[PDB]
Every structure is written in structure tokens, then in C-alpha cells.
């Protein structure tokens with residue numbers, strides 16, 4: 001989750 005969000009942002 002953390003990873004997904006960092007890249008999305």
C-alpha cells in the first residue's frame with residue numbers, strides 16, 4: 001500500500 005501511494009502521488 002505505502003509503495004502504491006507514493007508512486008500514485
Ligand SMILES: [Co+2]
Nearest residue numbers: 002003005006
Ligand atoms: Co511513505
